[PDB]
């Protein structure tokens, strides 16, 4: 897992491209993905 650098990521079959970072987002246990105002994915949970 790579952070603070631009990467062509794939989490659980959700492909994308971006700078991954750690985040302060307080996900509840049932949630795996977070969304922007645009419904573009905006945060993710690492499955491992």
């Amino acid at each position: 897992l790579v952070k603070n650098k631009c990467v062509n990521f794939n989490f659980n079959g959700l492909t994308g491209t971006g700078v991954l970072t750690e985040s302060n987002k307080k996900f509840l246990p049932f949630q795996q993905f977070g969304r922007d105002i645009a419904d573009t994915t905006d945060a993710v949970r690492d499955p491992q």
Binding site: I37, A38, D39, T40
Partner: protein
Amino acid sequence: QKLIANQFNSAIGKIQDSLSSTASALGKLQDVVNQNAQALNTLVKQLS
């Protein structure tokens, strides 16, 4: 001339009171800010 000068000075004083108290005076400029912000926010939401 002293009366006309005092009336002008007093009238400029009333502008400061109006602009300090009453934000709705500038509504014609704030609506140009709001319309252009709302148009971009609508354009973003239409990605979803």
